[PDB]
Curated annotation (Swiss-Prot), chain A:
Lineage: Eukaryota, Metazoa, Chordata, Craniata, Vertebrata
GO CC terms: cytoplasm; nucleolus; ribonucleoprotein complex; ribosome
Species of the source: Oryctolagus cuniculus (Rabbit)
Keywords: Acetylation, Cytoplasm, Isopeptide bond, Nucleus, Phosphoprotein, Ribonucleoprotein, Ribosomal protein, RNA-binding, rRNA-binding, Ubl conjugation
InterPro entries from the UniProt entry: Ribosomal_uL5, Ribosomal_uL5_C, Ribosomal_uL5_CS, Ribosomal_uL5_dom_sf, Ribosomal_uL5_N
Subunit structure: Component of the large ribosomal subunit (LSU). Part of the 5S RNP complex, which is a LSU subcomplex composed of the 5S RNA, RPL5 and RPL11. Component of a hexameric 5S RNP precursor complex, composed of 5S RNA, RRS1, RPF2/BXDC1, RPL5, RPL11 and HEATR3; this complex acts as a precursor for ribosome assembly. Interacts with PML. Interacts with MDM2 (via its RanBP2-type zinc finger domain); negatively regulates MDM2-mediated TP53 ubiquitination and degradation. Interacts with NOP53; retains RPL11 into the nucleolus.
Gene Ontology molecular function terms on file: rRNA binding; structural constituent of ribosome
One example of a Gene Ontology biological process annotation: translation
Modified residues (N6-acetyllysine): 45, 78
This protein's encoding gene: RPL11
Name assigned to this protein: Large ribosomal subunit protein uL5
Curated annotation (Swiss-Prot), chain C:
Sorted UniProt keywords: Acetylation, Cytoplasm, Isopeptide bond, Nucleus, Phosphoprotein, Ribonucleoprotein, Ribosomal protein, RNA-binding, rRNA-binding, Ubl conjugation
Protein name: Large ribosomal subunit protein uL18
GO molecular function, a single term: structural constituent of ribosome
Family indicated by similarity: Belongs to the universal ribosomal protein uL18 family.
Biological process, per Gene Ontology: ribosomal large subunit assembly; translation
Pfam families: Ribosomal_L18_c, Ribosomal_L5e
Superkingdom in the source lineage: Eukaryota
Description of how the protein assembles with itself and partners: Component of the large ribosomal subunit (LSU). Part of the 5S RNP complex, which is a LSU subcomplex composed of the 5S RNA, RPL5 and RPL11. Component of a hexameric 5S RNP precursor complex, composed of 5S RNA, RRS1, RPF2/BXDC1, RPL5, RPL11 and HEATR3; this complex acts as a precursor for ribosome assembly. Interacts with isoform 1 of NVL in an ATP-dependent manner. Interacts with RRP1B. Interacts with IPO5, IPO7 and KPNB1; these interactions may be involved in RPL5 nuclear import for the assembly of ribosomal subunits.
Cross-link (Glycyl lysine isopeptide (Lys-Gly) (interchain with G-Cter in SUMO2)): 218
Swiss-Prot record, chain D:
Keyword presence, Cytoplasm: yes
Domain of life: Eukaryota
One GO cellular component term noted in the UniProt record for this chain: cytosol
Originating organism: Oryctolagus cuniculus
Record's protein name: Large ribosomal subunit protein eL21
Region (Disordered): 111-144
Curated annotation (Swiss-Prot), chain E:
Subunit record text: Component of the large ribosomal subunit. Mature ribosomes consist of a small (40S) and a large (60S) subunit. The 40S subunit contains about 33 different proteins and 1 molecule of RNA (18S). The 60S subunit contains about 49 different proteins and 3 molecules of RNA (28S, 5.8S and 5S).
Primary location: cytoplasm
Ubl conjugation recorded as keyword: yes
Gene Ontology molecular function: structural constituent of ribosome
Record-level GO cellular component terms: cytosolic large ribosomal subunit
Name the UniProt record assigns to this protein: Large ribosomal subunit protein uL16
Superkingdom of this protein's organism: Eukaryota
Purpose: Component of the large ribosomal subunit. Plays a role in the formation of actively translating ribosomes. May play a role in the embryonic brain development.
Location in the cell: Cytoplasm
Cross-link (Glycyl lysine isopeptide (Lys-Gly) (interchain with G-Cter in ubiquitin)): 179
Species of the source: Oryctolagus cuniculus (Rabbit)
UniProt-listed GO biological process terms: regulation of translation; translation
Amino acid sequence: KENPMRELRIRKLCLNICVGESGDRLTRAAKVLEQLTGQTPVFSKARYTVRSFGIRRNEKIAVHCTVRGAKAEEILEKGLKVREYELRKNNFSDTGNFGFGIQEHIDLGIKYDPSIGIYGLDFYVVLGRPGFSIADKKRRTGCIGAKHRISKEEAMRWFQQKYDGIILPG
Amino acid sequence: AKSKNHTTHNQSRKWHRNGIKKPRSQRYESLKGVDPKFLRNMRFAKKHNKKGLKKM
Amino acid sequence: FVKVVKNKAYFKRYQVKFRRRREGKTDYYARKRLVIQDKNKYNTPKYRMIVRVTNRDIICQIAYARIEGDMIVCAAYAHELPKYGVKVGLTNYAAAYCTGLLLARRLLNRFGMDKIYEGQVEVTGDEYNVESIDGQPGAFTCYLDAGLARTTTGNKVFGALKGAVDGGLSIPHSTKRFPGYDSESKEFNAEVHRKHIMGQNVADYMRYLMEEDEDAYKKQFSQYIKNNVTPDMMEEMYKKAHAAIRENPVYEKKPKREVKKKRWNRPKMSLAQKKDRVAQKKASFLRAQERAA
Amino acid sequence: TNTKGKRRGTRYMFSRPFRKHGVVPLATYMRIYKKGDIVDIKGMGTVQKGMPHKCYHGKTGRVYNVTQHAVGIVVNKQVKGKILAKRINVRIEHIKHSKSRDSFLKRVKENDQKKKEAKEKGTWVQLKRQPAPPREAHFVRTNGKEPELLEPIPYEFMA
Amino acid sequence: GRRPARCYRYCKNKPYPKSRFCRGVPDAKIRIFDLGRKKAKVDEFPLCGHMVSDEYEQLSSEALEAARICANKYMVKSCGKDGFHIRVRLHPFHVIRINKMLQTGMRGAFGKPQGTVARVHIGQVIMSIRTKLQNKEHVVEALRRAKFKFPGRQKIHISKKWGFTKFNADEFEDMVAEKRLIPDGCGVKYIPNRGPLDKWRALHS
RNA sequence: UUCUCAAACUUUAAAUGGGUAAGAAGCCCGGCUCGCUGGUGUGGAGCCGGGCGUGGAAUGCGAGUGCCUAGUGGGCCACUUU
RNA sequence: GCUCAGGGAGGACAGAAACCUCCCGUGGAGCAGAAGGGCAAAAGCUCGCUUGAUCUUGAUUUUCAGUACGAAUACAGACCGU
RNA sequence: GUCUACGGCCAUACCACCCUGAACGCGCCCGAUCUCGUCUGAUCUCGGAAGCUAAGCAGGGUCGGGCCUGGUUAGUACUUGGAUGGGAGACCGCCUGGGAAUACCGGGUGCUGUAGGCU
């Protein structure tokens, strides 16, 4: 038997376009995520000036957009075809969550433009359980207990069983 | 021409010649330094003590 | 490989916060100002009106500071409204408002200021606040304790605050957090407040769903359907309750059933038990080793 | 010539005890202080407002004035030569009640019940604390066994 | 090079370490504190032999260095390179000050760091030599050579412990027999009967 | 696990040491005043009128108080810390 | 309203280091400056509104001679802010 | 027996992992029309009551870490007062009183206040 209150789902789909090319090439990156998500993103202002990379303190490096629920499933759905329904073992984190990276934004029903060009966006999947939203309230918060967590070994047999997507070695 | 800078050597001997006197232990402390909202009211409490003397 | 953050020595160092701060129930910063009295009062009880909104209940208390543990002087819960008229919808702004009115009129009964300080009997949503009469015993003044609830405009806590203010409690407040306050233009409506107080915020959603589809309505309001609550019955269902609170505010307690005395709980394993388990394990480890060879 | 100041040598005095930092217990704020309450001073470093000067830390005075936060407390800081009954406005977190007076009035009230009783009867009970006297002549029962002979251990060096 | 050790013999000043306040101190002449076959097991060097102070005095870092060399030199000429383990159970932390003259005078006097000195109490171990049960009358000689390198009086004690441990030599062999001790490098690991039983299960496997 | 430590490190932590208290200005009854404080003969403080001397640790000693005032303001030595 | 230093583990370009997530994290950061003390739903941090950085007596503390100035704690009378 | 709301002392209450939790509760939870917010109804807020106590929580467990509390270490260390004591000194001994702290070794693991439930 199974307990469907231990059903595994996606809490949020965290997407970012890290360009490090502020002003012209960063404000046009917002058009990609609004096409992909259907909601307005928040810009990623830097922490300090690194000089080898070519960033500056509080300069807009990236732009991020977290999507939840119904829309979040569909955006993660089409990205897996572009990573041909297979992920490396070491893509999966210790704390249940995972992610991967498709190299070009053009593959997600997004047509080319001589000004838009060839962006790179990066997926990260936050795998959740009913009652993972205890530890972020203003009332009585607490750690979820080790019995209730999602492990890397279980986060495989979510993906390996749900999508029937293979997990390649090498 | 340097000198001795400081001492407290003979001072304890001097302090007990007339005694280290504990301060003037008197009844009725003054109402000096009492919060002047409370002291207004206590001054009014004494002002109208005549009012309830035929009761008294 | 990296260092253990929580060493054998981390816990020698580690100071724990207060139990009510650890459990995440009390803000001791918020409590440090609410509860303590000006020390030139010399034991005047500093009354505060507590409102704690649960998932299925709204707990409204009046308490004052004691070193033993702050003593509750009066308390009315939301589950007492089914003896006045509010059968279901216990945890909405309308049922929050009735509980504030319940706590108010109960304390005023338990003192003898019941007939004095009527307050708002015609429920409006004006800024009414209780003003004491010369000769008649002075109005009960207390202060709202929101707890750990964010006080945005139209928090249910201000429902039970408006309940107390309309009962005969002289509480200082502003109508910024009462609903019907627009943040842009910054006026206050009597009517738009009353829509939430009498429960047309709920009744219009009952109409909106019943107009739209009969699958997502029969899910959303099971007990409003089950126990005959229509949007048209809604407004008068609370009006009947508001005079019903002012009929019988005095509380009759529920009698206890006799304690049969079975322990639902595992009592502590004593020393001679705790020491013998490991003595049996040190038998079980050594008796199950010799069999191998 | 020492660096003069107010909090000079209060590294350990106005420090907080180990694993008793953070939030102040709220009982400290809500215990009542009347006038003529004999009160001992102990500067809590967490609340910087209404601290006493370090020369009063540990010294016991009594209250002549109570406001919203502080109590005007008459203490006997001496000086070099004489003693001065002087008046400091210390906020209530830097202050406890003194249990020195609260062992005397308990002994007044107890030696009043032992006064009321044994008055009408003619019976007499001394109320002065007679000091711990030379202990009365007592018999020491040795019960069978001889008392153990102690003799000094010899010198043998450990380390 | 530096003064006679008469000048800085006695524990006069407060303990004055190389810290954030005293910076610009040269390194002690004793870099390495222990030598021999120190990569050895507990069970093969029972006979510990100590040098024990009589006086509350400061022994120099450069006296501890000479005593290290003198004791090492004899043990190799008796037992070979690998038939002993000598320690120095002092560490020269007390910084010694020098009010140098080349015209200044006592006007503005606080000495620069000269060197490091090891402050010693009475009945305190200066050097310790763990060796085999054979060479009982060599550690006595080896340390007696090194007493001349120190100021004041030192006493040589054949300790009742098992090498550089805190457990008696007549009990050490019988405490490992009941798995109360573990051989762990130079020293031993005392297991209390107070850890979790999954540790006890690992011992008796 | 282990050796060795800290005037400007510290969980612990003395000895000697610093306060305060050991009654009639004290305790317990009442009533009365208030413009302070309030759900409230509430909370406070102050006023009159009371009832109670087993003087409520030991030892010693008569205490208190006000003026006027000279000289001095180079000190040095020893015990123990330093 | 949040939680920091630092670390773990993941994720196109991306590496010791750019960004996005989860977890651990008693303060190991930060609080303009020296150092000490103090502090976690804050005293830190990001914002919303702001002029109590205002006017007026006295008392008190610190240095102290128990004088000043500086600094400071408690009040009280106004007028304000949140 | 046990819980909730508000608490008092603030680890005997913490941390880790595991097992069992009747009833009322407390919760996850259900949705986003209003109120209110957000990149996002996760959070905050509001309107609910289909399914689960899986978690949070509660109580128990651990030859558990910690913590508290005794024993020990030890009348040792140190120290008040004393000597025309010792000793080249360093420092030590005695006399007269006080008297610690780890290592090691046991014991314990929240008591409880006002107001309202449930058995």
